[PDB]
Nucleic acid binder design. Structure first.
Ligand SMILES: [Mg+2]
Ligand SMILES: [Mg+2]
Length: 596
DNA sequence: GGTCAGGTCAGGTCA
């Protein structure tokens, strides 16, 4: 009942020098080259595809089509997403066994299972180890994107920042022996960095760690007035204000790093004893006061704010900022709007000067990221009407809000979707259950909420454009799933495809109708059940056009019937946006080629 | 057969 192979590197093994008796000795040639490959003869430019072809003799596959079949899996590995899998069946089905010389002696009908396991051996003992030798997998944290960087480069970057973190005395060799709680990792996040700790497993302590986090969060609801729902505060404020809205979003930089431990410790002691007893208080106090981290066989003490990667740090920083909240935001004009996520602040008022004062206040209290500041203030260098905050885009002039989409140029959109589940596996003969589990609604549910479908402050044009953008996303996921179906299910029967799509469009439109009818507003005109379906269908249409030759049947299929009459009772909807693909998603890369 | 709360999972969002 195990049908999956995981692409991730940690599954790898450490190659024996010789292959055992149950495997054919040709493997050892490969292994030989492994040592020779190991020889420090590498320069900056290597291609893993290229070096592998000089490690595994072509005589192992015999024919070029077999070799290409195998290297296309290798290429998938080299371009992999986190959690991604393939079907074990891929490793043996459709190979030309006649042309493989070392497989002729054994009778043909017992041959397939052997070949799968032999290819598994090569992938686990030579391919993955060779990838590990020159590269480190890091999760970009934008979807499941994984970028590989040269080990020499990652180590150099990690040494540079280690020394910088040493000159500023953030890190100090402890020398007094102390049990370290975890290992430091330096993770790049664009121009800046993220220094985090991976905690050594401390079994039975995560019940304890969840308990302490829970009890503090209860304290943070109970003593400090909840920030409000982000949606409701903004709703009330939009109704309040009929004039031009003014606003600012600021991003505090290293909010954990700018925590003053003495003040936090005093907040701890100041907690009432009925909420959190003195023993737990004292356990927490030397916990944040004695942060010990293991580097290259050496232990250091972190003495700058809260350490990311600590179980308590996420929740603890919120308490500090929550306390800062009351310290500095008790008096605010109730004709104004304010909301905070954790280290991001969004503030709006009808008066420009009061927004300016808020900006000066925050800069006076905190070191901020000036590049991350967005404002409609006129006196600012690069002012904008669109403020991104908490996954959404707010237009202060129009009051319209759109979903925010994190698609950098050349981002590969298949990294956004986690299509493989190792815990519940689907057999290679069952593609339909796979595709429909892929199209479960819950996954896009976070773009099917009151925020995008309300008509209280949102126009019908923007509720449509939101639904469209989301449906564009669902189309891109369909595409990735289809490409998965061709390359590992090796499906030939596309007749059953044209079915769940419309079953989903119907159900999705119905769910939309429900939400839109649930949140009618003063800007709500009239929305036809069928019009939503037409929008969804036009979204799929716009997407499917990227790979026309593969889908020309399907596009033609939906071309007839499937009503797209975009004659909505509004007399304003441009409708050009709906017809084609928004520029954000025209420039994103769907194909797959092994770069390095 | 009709609810419920409780428990688990799932793919997603935010920081
Ligand atoms: Mg966990
Ligand atoms: Mg938990």
């Amino acid at each position: 009942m195990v049908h999956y192979y995981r692409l991730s590197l940690k599954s790898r093994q450490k190659a024996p020098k010789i292959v055992n008796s149950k495997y054919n000795s040709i493997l050892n040639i490969a292994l030989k080259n492994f040592r020779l490959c190991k020889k420090h003869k590498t320069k900056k430019p290597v291609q893993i595809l290229a070096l592998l072809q000089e490690i595994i003799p072509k005589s192992y596959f015999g024919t070029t089509t077999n070799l290409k079949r195998f290297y296309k899996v290798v290429e998938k590995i080299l371009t992999q997403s986190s959690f991604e899998c393939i079907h074990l069946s891929v490793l043996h089905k459709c190979y030309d066994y006649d042309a493989i010389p070392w497989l002729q002696n054994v009778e043909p009908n017992l041959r397939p299972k052997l070949l799968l396991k032999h290819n598994l051996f090569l992938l686990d003992n030579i391919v993955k180890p060779i990838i590990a030798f020159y590269y480190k997998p890091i999760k970009t944290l934008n979807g499941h994107e994984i970028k590989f960087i040269r080990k020499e480069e990652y180590i150099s970057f990690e040494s540079k920042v280690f020394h910088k973190l040493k000159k500023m005395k953030y890190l100090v060799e402890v020398q007094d022996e102390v049990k370290p709680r975890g290992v430091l990792n330096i993770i790049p996040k664009q121009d800046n960095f993220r220094a985090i700790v991976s905690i050594f497993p401390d079994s039975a302590r995560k019940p304890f760690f969840k308990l302490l986090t829970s009890k503090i969060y209860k304290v943070l609801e109970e003593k400090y007035k909840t920030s409000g729902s982000l949606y409701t505060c903004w709703s009330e404020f939009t109704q309040k204000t009929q004039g031009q809205i003014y606003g600012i979003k600021v991003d505090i930089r290293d909010a954990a790093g700018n925590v003053k431990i003495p003040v936090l410790c005093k907040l701890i002691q100041s907690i009432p004893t009925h909420l959190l007893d003195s023993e737990k208080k004292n356990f927490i106090v030397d916990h944040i006061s004695n942060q010990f981290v293991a580097f290259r066989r050496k232990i250091y003490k972190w003495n700058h704010g809260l350490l990311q990667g600590d179980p308590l740090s996420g929740c603890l920083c919120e308490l500090y900022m929550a306390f800062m909240d009351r310290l500095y935001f008790s008096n605010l004009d109730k004709d104004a709007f304010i909301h905070r996520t954790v280290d991001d602040y969004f503030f709006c008022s009808p008066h420009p000067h009061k927004v300016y004062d808020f900006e000066l206040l925050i800069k006076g209290v905190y070191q901020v990221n000036p590049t991350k500041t967005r404002t409609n203030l006129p006196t600012h260098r690069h002012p904008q009407d669109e403020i991104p905050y908490c996954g959404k885009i707010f237009n202060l002039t129009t009051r319209q809000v759109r979903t925010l989409y994190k698609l950098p140029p050349n981002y590969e959109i298949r990294h956004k979707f986690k299509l493989w589940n190792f815990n519940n596996q689907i057999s290679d003969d069952n593609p339909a259950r796979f595709l429909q589990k892929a199209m479960d609604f819950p996954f896009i549910c976070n773009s099917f909420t009151k925020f995008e479908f309300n008509t209280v402050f949102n126009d019908q044009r923007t509720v449509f454009a939101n639904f469209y953008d989301a449906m564009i996303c669902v189309a891109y996921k369909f595409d990735a799933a289809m490409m998965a179906l061709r390359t590992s299910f090796l499906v030939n029967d596309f007749g059953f495809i044209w079915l769940v799509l419309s079953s989903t469009v119907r159900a999705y439109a119905s769910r939309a109708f429900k939400k839109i009818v649930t949140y009618k507003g003063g800007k709500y005109r009239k929305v036809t059940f069928q019009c939503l379906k037409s929008i969804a269908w036009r979204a799929f249409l716009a997407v499917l056009k990227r790979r026309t030759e593969i889908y020309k049947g399907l596009i033609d299929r939906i071309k007839s019937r499937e009503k797209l009459t975009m004659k909505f009772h509004d007399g304003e909807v441009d409708a050009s946006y709906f017809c084609k693909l928004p520029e954000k998603f025209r420039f994103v890369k769907i194909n797959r080629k092994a770069s390095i």
